[PDB]
Structure formats: structure tokens, C-alpha cells
Amino acid sequence: MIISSLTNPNFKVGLPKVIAEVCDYLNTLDLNALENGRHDINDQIYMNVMEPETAEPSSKKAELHHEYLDVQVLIRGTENIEVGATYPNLSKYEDYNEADDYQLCADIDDKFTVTMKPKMFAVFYPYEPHKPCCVEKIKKLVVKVPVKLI
Template sequence: MFFGDLNRQDYKRGLPQVIVDICEQLNTMNLDDLTVGRHDLTADIYMNVQTLTTEAAEKRKSEFHRKYIDVQVLISGKESLDYSLAFPDDKDYTPYNSDDDYQLTLTHDLAHKNTLTLSPKQFVVFLPYEVHKPCCNVEGETYEIKKLVVKIPIDLL
């Protein structure tokens, strides 16, 4: 997992080159003007732009991916993301959805939970098998958010 802030001059320090390239591309865009839906960034990399309402973490399910890296960038609002450093145990998750590359937890609990809160232009990168629960309320407050999630095949790392 990596996290950073596209507003900082040094946001790319220590990031793998493919993530640096995507962040540089994002920094040339007017993120506020992006339309909701899928946008292809390269032949292999795409992003989904979403507008959502955050929810209490207790109501959200965790997820992880196998084939794709998630680069989640908050465009507007505030969002907390719960995550775990524990390796996921398949028995605690739904069957793998290979078409959309995800598994969801069977419960709302997250073992060894940590929380990260994002403000606009901050990002978090989740590698395959890193469990995360996005779109959570911030300190009990609900927010309308706009965010994007870039999907990078792990093979490009």
C-alpha cells in the first residue's frame, strides 16, 4: 500500500514508475470535470469515476483484488478507508468474481483494522490481496464524494 497527495511536489518519490506515470497523467487533467463512468487511460489501464455517499464503516464490506492495482483518488468531499495488513482468508470472503476482479468479505468486520482519511487530490494505492473498505464516513459524518479508481494490471508493476 502507498498513499500520497497529488498537491505535493514530491508525491511520486518512492512510487513504482507505472503509478508515477498515471499520477502525472491525472495531474494534467481537470478532475472536477471528469464525467462519471469508465475512461481508458492506456490500452491496459482504465479508471472509473464515481459519485457516492459515504456510509458508516459498519455498513460497508471490505474487498480485495487479485489481478489489478487500485489507485483511488478523491476528487471532492472527504472519505475514510479502512484497511487491513492481514492476508485475506478465502473462507471469510465471497467467491472470487473473475470478471470484475474482486472478493467481498462475508461480514462487515475487518481484522486488524486501520483507517486512512482522504481529502481532495490525495490518493491511496492498494496492491492485490490488500484488503480495503472504501467510501466510509469521516468521524461519523456523511459526505457526498466524487472519486476515481484507476485499475492497473499487476503485470505492469
């Protein structure tokens, strides 16, 4: 997983090209005024933006994905995302939802919490578990990028 900030003038060091181009593109936008909903960027890449409410961790399931990477960025507010960097125990995950490309699990092993501030972004590759929106209302966006583009 990658954790970084669009605002850091060196955030592109190390980044896969496709991810660098989407971040360079997000830095062009009026992120504040972005409408809620789905926004297409490419044939391949879209993003969803929303104003959810942080909810207590035990109230929601972690997720992971098979086909897309996420680039999540926080726009307004502050948000916790529990994450695991070790490969999940798939035997413990719900059935794969193929239309929305995800599987759920009550919890993350070896989990730790990333605290997100405006313009911070996290990249979670496929099979990287994350439970975003953890503990109050925020604005955020997640970009969905096919991993085959890496």
C-alpha cells in the same frame, strides 16, 4: 499500500514507475469536470469516476482484487477508507468474482482507517483489503492497473 498526495511535489519518490506515470497523467486533468463513468487511458489501464455517498462501515463489505491494483483518488469531499496492511485470511472471503476481479468480506483484521482529503491517493495492491466510501456525498476516481505492470 501507499498513501500520498498528487499535490506533494515529491510524491513520486518510491513509487513504481507505472503508478508515477498515471499520477503524472492525473495531474494534467480537470479532475472536477471529469464525467461520471468509465474512462480508458491505455490498452491496459482504465479508471472509473463517480459521485457515491459515504455509507456507514457495517453497511458494506470490504474488498480485495487479484489481478489489478487500485489507485483511488478523492477529488471533492472527504472520505474514510478502512484498510488492513496484514495479509487477509482468505478462508473468510466470499467467492472470487472473476468478471469484476474481487472478493468480499464482512470485515478487516488489524484494520485502521485512512482519512482522505482532495488530491490524496491510496494504492492498494492485490490482496490488500479496503472498504472505501465510509462515513454525505463525494467525488472520486479509481484507476485500475494490472499488477503485472509493476
